Amino acid sequence: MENAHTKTVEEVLGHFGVNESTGLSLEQVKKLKERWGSNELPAEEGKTLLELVIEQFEDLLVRILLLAACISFVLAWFEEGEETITAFVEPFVILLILVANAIVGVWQERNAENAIEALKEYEPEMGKVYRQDRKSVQRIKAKDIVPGDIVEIAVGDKVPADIRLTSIKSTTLRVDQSILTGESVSVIKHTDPVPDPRAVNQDKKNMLFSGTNIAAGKAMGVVVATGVNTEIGKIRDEMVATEQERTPLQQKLDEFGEQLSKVISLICIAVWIINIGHFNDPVHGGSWIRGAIYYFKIAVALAVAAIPEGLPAVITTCLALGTRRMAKKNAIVRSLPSVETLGCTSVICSDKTGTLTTNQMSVCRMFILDRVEGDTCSLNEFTITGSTYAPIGEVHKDDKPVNCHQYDGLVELATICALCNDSALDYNEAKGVYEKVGEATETALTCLVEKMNVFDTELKGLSKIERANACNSVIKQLMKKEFTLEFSRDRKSMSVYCTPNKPSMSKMFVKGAPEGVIDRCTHIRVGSTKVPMTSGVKQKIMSVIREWGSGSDTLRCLALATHDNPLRREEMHLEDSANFIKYETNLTFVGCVGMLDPPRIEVASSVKLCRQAGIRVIMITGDNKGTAVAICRRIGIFGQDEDVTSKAFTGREFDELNPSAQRDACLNARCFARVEPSHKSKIVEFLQSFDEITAMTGDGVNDAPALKKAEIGIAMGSGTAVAKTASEMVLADDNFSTIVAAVEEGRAIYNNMKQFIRYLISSNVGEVVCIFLTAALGFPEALIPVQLLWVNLVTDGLPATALGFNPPDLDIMNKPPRNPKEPLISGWLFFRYLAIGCYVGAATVGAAAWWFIAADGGPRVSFYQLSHFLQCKEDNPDFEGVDCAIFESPYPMTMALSVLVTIEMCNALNSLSENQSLLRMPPWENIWLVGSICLSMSLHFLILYVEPLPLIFQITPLNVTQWLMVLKISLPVILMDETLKFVARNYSWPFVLLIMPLVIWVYSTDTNFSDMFWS
């Protein structure tokens, strides 16, 4: 069944072979089940643990670590030695770091799916259908309905399938379609066919779309589409068809991994090339192959040691900590890399109905009269602060609290509001929020009546379930509602006949569009006085009503009047519309109210903060252009008097725009209205075409393709499930300020990530340069792989985690988002961490050599003997026996390890700021860094001072003067990093007064290095 809206009821009924009054026979029911399936949206759960692990191993950094681990393992398998116990420790541990990380990430996934599923609406999805088995209404499951069923719908029901209207039994049919079409107000439905076959769902007035509630009335329809063929099903299919791309953080990490791999390959090739002439050495066997592969093995072993083993682990730790911080403020983030996406976001595409607004219409203004002199009147105007359906707001006149007993016109207005509606407000114990029963506007009037206690009834001890209807209950107990005059299309008003319950009358209460009520009223209720109507007062009322319904505060105005002396029920006949016209005569104007779909109270501040942070907010909605522009003006996207002739567009207007005009609109326009979900995705894609990180926010089904297409999609906690499944983050508490909070968190996370990435890379390149320098000169080895493993996982691991807690920059929220094209590590950074790395290598080699040359108490071995480590024989030494037993002493190794650790701690203290000096920013603020440094020193001393560990790591306790020399070697890294940082910047006192005694203490003495030869 295609374009059913274009066909009449007879055509669709003949096509389905179903009678209007009988329904479908049980045979046709199963015949349609076998063909069309069943009415369920498919729910696929293919994210098994194996799938999650394999997709989380997609990261290029993790792949590089895996390659390094496997190469190290195959190198350790062909080492022809008996030290396989330790030689295999280095790769294996990496695998643990690679696997444990995975669970962490996987855990986060499950945790998100455990939280997002918690905040899902759960109810039995039922449906009232007619079938030939029994004549009465049959309440069956919605999944057991088929295309062709005759469905009966009533007020406060959710339609279960795409339905073409057949007959309306309540003379009207109001449907709330904000879920699908994004319309803030309920739409009127009819039975007449829609001739347009390409018509959008907003103007399919004869159609009912699954997932949309019925605001008021009863109706009878026939199912034409079911399951995935419904509009929501088509949108879900489009959402699935949309491709998902990697987050910008993942792209930056992959680029950094490519740069790191290029550096590793260059280092390996260079080390191989430097030893071309040694290939044919007789030591290998005098062959061009064995020596070449031996030196290739050495070069690859050196290259593998330049990859930080713990870098992905600390990156994941920082991401998980940020995710936990966001979860603490009611923000569920699915993937760990997505926590950073909002930091680099440049454009925030949003949704008006249900996302930028509460979707709960509430009365925000009202007025009555106070006094009349002549050709004019004094007008009492009141403002109501409530925005949701909760009856907790207050009525303010001239921005001060006001009571309601003093204003008799106000109690009369409250009576008219509560008695001239048939909807209600009710509280869900499970959901925990008040909601409407029937029409949204009538619920707004009910909540207004609850807000202003016109009879000052006691409400302190009242429970929340009975808080919903207390004042309305009181003033409906006072007045008995006899009968209701139904609202008409030819007369935009509705009336209620009420009689005073107390004996010793029978007033009429009329509401509706202001024009009709004003032209049909000949009197004015001023306080308790019925004064004759005057042209001046009517003009004064028209002025305020138009300026209420025409400015940036565009409102839906309802005029409330009363008929004091109506004809008694015998005269009036409730049969014809013209009778209803003639019954409403000589009315008395009482007041007027003005309501809207109000934006959430944290929206204007959030958008101005986003604009301050360099992010522009563009509203994309399916509602009309007028309401969208009004909400943009109200929340601060547009000014009150700003011209929007080129900044607000409709889908039809955007359809035939020039490509240059489309580019200019995407660059400049800030409001899109009357756009289909495909149009929303097209807008998001056009914005992404300009290399802009786009964050889409929405709640409804129409936002799902746009939420999926954006780099990060944010779904409201009250939104639909399909919108939540397409979004990377969910706001559980529906707080829009969480967006700017997440932006700040992401920017801080990115800064800290850069800091500790630089720290780890510098440490590893320093160790590699140390090994290369040791090999080139010929000195005895100063470091061993197991020692480097410890100093890379603990001594470097703890400072990196602490650096993850770096204080945020002061000017973090006053800068534009970072350019996506810039690399994570720049060329200047590339130069700088090499400087610290080269200094670490040189300092560690020098510390190892100092104990063998100039240290007091150690052998004063010359450079020639020290360079010829392997030549410990009768080659004219001084202490030939002593030297052979001292070249393997643990003292130089301890010197090297201590110097490396101390320089790493100094570099960690230099990693508080990317370019801000340590003097101005002391370590005090990041107390986590100080605690981590102290803990690492404590455990290092424990390693140095226990029984087993000095055997496992060949290290021994040092002396006071030896520690002093270690500090002497380590400290200048502070000076060199400070001068590099100062150079970068150019182109407190307690910290100084504590560090000066330390500096003067350790530079009291100096030792000369007797070495003037190089290899």
Ligand code: BEF
């Ligand atoms: F709900 Be949005 F206005 F499409």
Ligand SMILES: [Mg+2]
């Ligand atoms: Mg919405």
